[PDB]
Design a binder for this molecule. Structure first.
Ligand SMILES: N[C@@H](CC(=O)N1CCC[C@H]1CNC(=O)c1ccccc1)Cc1ccccc1F
Ligand SMILES: *C1O[C@H](CO)[C@@H](O)[C@H](O)[C@H]1NC(C)=O
Ligand SMILES: *[C@@H]1O[C@H](CO)[C@@H](O)[C@H](O)[C@H]1NC(C)=O
Ligand SMILES: *[C@@H]1O[C@H](CO)[C@@H](O)[C@H](O)[C@H]1NC(C)=O
Ligand SMILES: *[C@@H]1O[C@H](CO)[C@@H](O)[C@H](O)[C@H]1NC(C)=O
Length: 728
C-alpha cells in the first residue's frame, strides 16, 4: 500500500482518532463542540442549535483550557493558567461568565491558584478549594462562604486528596460530593502530619543557580499513613453572620480499631449517604448507610444497615470495593461482588437485610454497573464468546432476572467487540462507544425499545487515510498452560507471510488485574515497529491478570514478582516455538509494573530473551506506596511478609544480567516510582560487574509526557531495539 506507519507518525500524531465527547444536561439533551462552537443536541430527533459561538471569547485575554457550563445553563466556568501537579491534580485560575447578562463576572472572582472547583448538580451553586480549604458560593457573584479553616499545605487537606488517596484510592484530586438536590456537601479531610517525606531535586531551567528540592508526604510500605475524617454540610443553611457547622460522620466501630481508609462515597438520595471503609489490611471493608435527621440536623448510621465485604483468597474487589447503584427510593441497591465461584457478579442488596441475591453468574465477569431504571439494570460485561478482553452492553429484567438482552453484540460484530457507554439522566437514551478491533464508532440509541437512532462519529476520514498505509494486523487468541486458558495479542507486520522468521517484542505490564490482551484498536509505538520495522509485538495476560475470575487474579496475592513473571516467560517460550518467530531475536520492554516485571524476567536467566528495555520500573517493594503495595504484599515485617518483600527485588538478580543487554530509563522528577527504585537497580548492577545502558530524563515525571521528551525516548528505545534485532 506504499507508505508505512512511520515512527514520527506515532510521535507527531499524523493519524488522529476522532471521538465523540458529549455532555448530557437532562434526560434528552447533550453538549458537543463542532469545530469550536458549543452545540446542544436533541437526542430523540438529532436536531441541534448553537449554544455558544467559537468567537464569544475572542477578547477574553487568556488562553482558555477547559470550560464547564452549569446545570441551569445560566453560567459558564472558564479554566486558565492550568498548572499541572500529580496524575490528576492541578491549580488553575478561573473566571465565571454570565450568559444571560452577556458579560464576565468581577464581584469576588474565584481566587487564583485554586485546586478544585465544581458546580452543584442542580441550579448554580459553587464549591472549591484554595489552600486546602473548602469554600461554597451560593451565587456566582455574591461572597463565597468559608467551610473549613484547618487547611495547611502538605499537612491538612479539606475537600481535596493528599497524595496516596489521589493515586491509589480515588484516582482524583477531589474529595467533594454533592447531594443530588445540591442541598448537602459531603467531604473528607485527611491528616498527613506524621507521613514521611519523599525528597528529590528538580533542576528547573538553566537560569536557576541552585537546584530545587521537592518534598512530598508519601508513605512507603509499612510507614505511618494519613488519617481521614468525614463531614457533610448543609448548604441551604449557610449564612455570613455565623460560620458553618459541618456534621462529622464517624467511621464504624470495626474500623476505628486500627488504620483504615475511606474508599467509597456514593450518595443514595436527597437525604441518605453511602460510604465504605477498608481496614489497613485490605481483605475486609464496611459499608455504611446514613440518613439526615430532619429534626436534629444530624446524620445516623444504624448497624442494621452496615454491610461487610470480605476476602479469604486475597484483597477486596478489583482495585477496591465496587460502587453501589441505588434504586430511586434509596431502600435498596446493586453492586459487584465476587461470588462463591470467585467470579465477579451483580449481587442485589436490600438496605435493611442480611445477605444479598445474585442475579448474574457464569465463567466471566461483569465489568461495571452502568445504569438503573425501574425495569432494567444496564451493565457492561465480557460474556460474549468467552472473550475476556471484550466488552458489550447488556440489560437485565428487574422482574425476571432470566431475561437478559445483549445490546451491543450484534450491532457491528466484525468492527466492534469492545464498547463503553454513556447514559442520559434517567436512562432515556444512550451513546454506545466502540473502540475496536475496527476504527472507533460513536452511535446514539434510545432505551425505550433500544432503537438505533443516529451515527454520531464513524471515523470515516481516518479510515481512508489509513487505507493508504501498510497498517499491521492484530491477533487475539489463547494458549493453554496447565489446562487453563491465557489469552495474548500480537501486532503483525503488513503482508505477514507466516513462512518467514520475524523478530519478536514482548510488551508487558502484568500487574494485579491488568489486561494487555484485548480487542481495542490502538495506534502507538507497537504500531510502528510492526508496519515500518517488520517486528511482531506480542502481549500476554498470565496469572495476576484481570477479568477472568479470582483464582487467576489472586494467584499473585502476597507473591508479586512470582507467577506473573513466571508465565510471561513460558509464553515467550511458546512464542519462539512458533514458525514465524526468530528464536534468536526475542525482546521485552515494559513501563512501571511493566519495567519491574521486565527487569525481573530479564535477570531470570531463562535464555529466551536477548535484550529488553525497562522504563520507570519498581525494584524493591518496600520502596513503593503503602496503599497499593500493602493491598498485595501485606506488611514488610518478619511476622508478616518480609520474607517475599526480600525475595522479590530486581536488585538480587544482578548476576543474571550478564546474559542480556539491559536498557534502563527513569525521569529525575518521578514522584510516583522514585528514581530511587532505578538507582538501587544500577548500583547493584555496577556492584556485581554487569554492563548495561541507561538514560535519566531530567525533570520528567512518571509518564515522561513532555512532547520533546516523549519524542526523545521513543526515539531512543527505537535505536536500541533496531540494534538488538540486527535491524538495518
Ligand atoms: N499507583 C497505581 C495506581 C493504579 O494502578 N490504579 C489506581 C486505580 C486502580 C488502578 C488503575 N490503574 C492505573 O491507573 C494504571 C497506572 C499505570 C499503568 C497502568 C494502569 C499505578 C501504578 C501501579 C504499579 C506501579 C506503578 C504505578 F504507578
Ligand atoms: C469561624 O469559626 C471557626 C471555628 O472553626 C473559627 O476558627 C473562625 O476564626 C471563626 N470566625 C469568627 C470570628 O466567627
Ligand atoms: C429541536 O427541535 C425542536 C422543535 O423545534 C425545538 O423546539 C428545539 O428547541 C430544538 N432544539 C435544538 C437542540 O436544536
Ligand atoms: C489573579 O492573578 C492575576 C495575575 O496576577 C491578577 O491580575 C488578578 O487580579 C488575580 N485575581 C484574583 C481574584 O486574585
Ligand atoms: C492531625 O493529627 C495529629 C496527630 O497525628 C494532631 O496532633 C493534629 O492536631 C491533627 N490535625 C487535625 C486538625 O486533625
Amino acid at each position: 500500500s506504499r507508505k508505512t506507519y512511520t515512527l514520527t507518525d506515532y510521535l507527531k500524531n499524523t493519524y488522529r482518532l476522532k471521538l465523540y465527547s458529549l455532555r448530557w444536561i437532562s434526560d434528552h439533551e447533550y453538549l458537543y463542540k463542532q469545530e469550536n462552537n458549543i452545540l446542544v443536541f436533541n437526542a430523540e430527533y438529532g436536531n441541534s442549535s448553537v449554544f455558544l459561538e467559537n468567537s464569544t471569547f475572542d477578547e477574553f485575554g487568556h488562553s482558555i483550557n477547559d470550560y464547564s457550563i452549569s446545570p441551569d445553563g445560566q453560567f459558564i466556568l472558564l479554566e486558565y493558567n492550568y498548572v499541572k501537579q500529580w496524575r490528576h491534580s492541578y491549580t488553575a485560575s478561573y473566571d465565571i461568565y454570565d450568559l444571560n447578562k452577556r458579560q464576565l463576572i468581577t464581584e469576588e472572582r474565584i481566587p487564583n491558584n485554586t485546586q478544585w472547583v465544581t458546580w452543584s448538580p442542580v441550579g448554580h451553586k459553587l464549591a472549591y478549594v484554595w489552600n486546602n480549604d473548602i469554600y461554597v458560593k451560593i451565587e456566582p457573584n455574591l461572597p463565597s462562604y468559608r467551610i473549613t479553616w484547618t487547611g495547611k499545605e502538605d499537612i491538612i487537606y479539606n475537600g481535596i486528596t493528599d497524595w496516596v488517596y489521589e493515586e491509589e484510592v480515588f484516582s482524583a484530586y477531589s474529595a467533594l460530593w454533592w447531594s443530588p438536590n445540591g442541598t448537602f456537601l459531603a467531604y473528607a479531610q485527611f491528616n498527613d502530619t506524621e507521613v514521611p517525606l519523599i525528597e528529590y531535586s528538580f533542576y528547573s531551567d538553566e537560569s536557576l543557580q541552585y537546584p530545587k528540592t521537592v518534598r512530598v508526604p508519601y508513605p512507603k510500605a509499612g510507614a505511618v499513613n494519613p488519617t481521614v475524617k468525614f463531614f457533610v454540610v448543609n448548604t441551604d443553611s449557610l449564612s455570613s453572620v455565623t460560620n458553618a457547622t459541618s456534621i462529622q460522620i464517624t467511621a464504624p466501630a470495626s474500623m476505628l480499631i486500627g488504620d483504615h481508609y475511606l474508599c467509597d462515597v456514593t450518595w443514595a438520595t436527597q437525604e441518605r449517604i453511602s460510604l465504605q471503609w477498608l481496614r489497613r489490611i485490605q481483605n475486609y471493608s464496611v459499608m455504611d448507610i446514613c440518613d439526615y435527621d430532619e429534626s436534629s440536623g444530624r446524620w445516623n448510621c444504624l448497624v442494621a444497615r452496615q454491610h461487610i465485604e470480605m476476602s479469604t483468597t486475597g484483597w477486596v474487589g478489583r482495585f477496591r470495593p465496587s460502587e453501589p447503584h441505588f434504586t430511586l427510593d434509596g431502600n435498596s441497591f446493586y453492586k459487584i461482588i465476587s461470588n462463591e465461584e470467585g467470579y465477579r457478579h451483580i449481587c442485589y442488596f436490600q438496605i435493611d437485610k442480611k445477605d444479598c441475591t445474585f442475579i448474574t453468574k457464569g465463567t466471566w465477569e461483569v465489568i461495571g454497573i452502568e445504569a438503573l431504571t425501574s425495569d432494567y439494570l444496564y451493565y457492561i460485561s465480557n460474556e460474549y464468546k468467552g472473550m475476556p478482553g471484550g466488552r458489550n452492553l447488556y440489560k437485565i429484567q428487574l422482574s425476571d432476572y432470566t431475561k437478559v438482552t445483549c445490546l451491543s453484540c450484534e450491532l457491528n460484530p466484525e468492527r466492534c467487540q469492545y464498547y463503553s457507554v454513556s447514559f442520559s439522566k434517567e436512562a432515556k437514551y444512550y451513546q454506545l462507544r466502540c473502540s475496536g478491533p475496527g476504527l472507533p464508532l460513536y452511535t446514539l440509541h434510545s432505551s425505550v425499545n433500544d432503537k438505533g437512532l443516529r451515527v454520531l462519529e464513524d471515523n470515516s476520514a481516518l479510515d481512508k487515510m489509513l487505507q493508504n498505509v501498510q497498517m499491521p494486523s492484530k491477533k487475539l487468541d489463547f494458549i493453554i498452560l496447565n489446562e487453563t486458558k491465557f489469552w495474548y495479542q500480537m501486532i503483525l507486520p503488513p503482508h505477514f507471510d507466516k513462512s518467514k522468521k520475524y523478530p519478536l517484542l514482548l510488551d508487558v505490564y502484568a500487574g494485579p488485574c491488568s489486561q494487555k490482551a484485548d480487542t481495542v484498536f490502538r495506534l502507538n509505538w507497537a504500531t510502528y515497529l510492526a508496519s515500518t520495522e517488520n517486528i511482531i509485538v506480542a502481549s500476554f495476560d498470565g496469572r495476576g491478570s484481570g477479568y477472568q475470575g479470582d483464582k487467576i487474579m489472586h494467584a499473585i496475592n502476597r507473591r508479586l514478582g512470582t507467577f506473573e513473571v513466571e508465565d510471561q516467560i513460558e509464553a515467550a517460550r511458546q512464542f519462539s516455538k512458533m514458525g514465524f518467530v526468530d528464536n534468536k531475536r526475542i525482546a521485552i520492554w515494559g513501563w512501571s509494573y511493566g519495567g519491574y516485571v521486565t527487569s525481573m524476567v530479564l535477570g531470570s536467566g531463562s535464555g529466551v530473551f536477548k535484550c529488553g528495555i525497562a522504563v520507570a520500573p519498581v525494584s524493591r517493594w518496600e520502596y513503593y506506596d503503602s496503599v497499593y503495595t500493602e493491598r498485595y504484599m501485606g506488611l514488610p515485617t518478619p511476622e508478616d511478609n518480609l520474607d517475599h518483600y526480600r525475595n522479590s527485588t530486581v536488585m538480587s538478580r544482578a548476576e543474571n544480567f550478564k546474559q542480556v543487554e539491559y536498557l534502563l530509563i527513569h525521569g529525575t522528577a518521578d514522584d510516583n516510582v522514585h528514581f530511587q527504585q532505578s538507582a538501587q537497580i544500577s548500583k547493584a548492577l555496577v556492584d556485581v560487574g554487569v554492563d548495561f545502558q541507561a538514560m535519566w530524563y531530567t525533570d520528567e515525571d512518571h509518564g515522561i509526557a513532555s512532547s520533546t521528551a516523549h519524542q526523545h525516548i521513543y526515539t531512543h528505545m527505537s535505536h536500541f531495539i533496531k540494534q538488538c534485532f540486527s535491524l538495518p
